C-alpha cells in the first residue's frame, strides 16, 4: 500500500493543443538521460512553465465509494501539489529490458519509459499520480 515509483523530471516540451485548460507535457528524467515520460496536465489548476523541475511519484493507495475529506482528520498521503487517479491500459515492451507503461486519468493520458520501475507497476486499476512543485 506504498509508493511504486519515484523520480524527478525536467520539463522539456509543453503544448496546449486545441484545448484551453489542459496541456500535453513531455519531460525526461533528471541526472538520468534514459527514462522519459509524457502526460496530460490541467494547467488551470496546476500551471506548468517550460524547463521546470517537478517531482513525480506513483502510488498504489492512500471498490469503496468515494467520500470527500470530512475534516482535517483525514491524513492525506500527499504533501504534493497535484494528484490524480487513473488506470494502466498498456505495458509497452519497447526493447530488450526497456519497458513503457500507459495510464489514463479520466482521459488525461500518460506514457512512461525506462526499466527501473519493472518490479512495481502491475496491471492494476489502482494507480495514483502525485506531483510536487
Amino acid at each position: 500500500s506504498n509508493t511504486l515509483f519515484d523520480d524527478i523530471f525536467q520539463v522539456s516540451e509543453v503544448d496546449p493543443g486545441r484545448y484551453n485548460k489542459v496541456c500535453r507535457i513531455e519531460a525526461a528524467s533528471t541526472t538520468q538521460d534514459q527514462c522519459k515520460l509524457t502526460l496530460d496536465i490541467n494547467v488551470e489548476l496546476f500551471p506548468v512553465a517550460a524547463q521546470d523541475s517537478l517531482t513525480v511519484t506513483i502510488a498504489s493507495s492512500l471498490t469503496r465509494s468515494w467520500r470527500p475529506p470530512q475534516a482535517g482528520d483525514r491524513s492525506l498521503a500527499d504533501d504534493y501539489d497535484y494528484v490524480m487517479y487513473g488506470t494502466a491500459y498498456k505495458f509497452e515492451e519497447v526493447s530488450k529490458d526497456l519497458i513503457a507503461v500507459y495510464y489514463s486519468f479520466g482521459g488525461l493520458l500518460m506514457r512512461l519509459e525506462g526499466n527501473y520501475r519493472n518490479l512495481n507497476n502491475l496491471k492494476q486499476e489502482n494507480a495514483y499520480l502525485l506531483i510536487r512543485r
Binding site: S65, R67, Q70, A71
Partner: protein, 114 residues
C-alpha cells in the same frame, strides 16, 4: 383537451402525502424522498444546503418528468446519522438564513429613501 388542471402543480390530491420515504437498495445509510407538488425551487435549495453539512456523503435531486410537479431527493450520510436529521438541519439553516435576509432587507429598505 388533454391538459391537466393547472392546480395539480401544487395541490395534492387523493391521499398524496407530501413526503414519501424509501430506503435505498444496495446503499448503506441512504434514502430516497419523493417530494410531491414541488419543483426545482425547493429541491435545488435543499440539495445545495445539504452539500455544506460535512457529514453528508451523497445528496442529489432529479425531476423524472417536467409533465409532473414532483421530484426525487436521494441522501446518504455517515453511519449513525439518520438522514432525516440532515434534511431537518439543512431546512432549518435555510429558514434561519431566510429570516436574516428578510430582516437585513427591511433594515436597508427603511433606511432607503424614495
Amino acid at each position: 383537451m388533454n391538459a391537466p388542471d393547472r392546480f395539480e402543480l401544487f395541490l395534492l390530491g387523493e391521499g398524496e402525502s407530501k413526503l414519501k420515504i424509501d430506503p435505498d437498495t444496495k446503499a448503506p445509510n441512504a434514502v430516497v424522498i419523493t417530494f410531491e407538488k414541488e419543483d426545482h425551487t425547493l429541491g435545488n435549495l435543499i440539495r445545495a444546503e445539504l452539500l455544506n453539512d460535512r457529514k453528508v456523503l451523497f445528496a442529489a435531486y432529479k425531476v423524472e418528468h417536467p409533465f409532473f410537479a414532483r421530484f426525487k431527493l436521494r441522501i446518504q450520510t455517515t453511519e449513525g446519522y439518520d438522514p432525516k436529521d440532515a434534511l431537518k438541519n439543512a431546512c432549518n439553516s435555510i429558514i434561519n438564513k431566510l429570516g436574516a435576509l428578510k430582516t437585513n432587507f427591511e433594515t436597508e429598505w427603511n433606511l432607503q429613501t424614495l
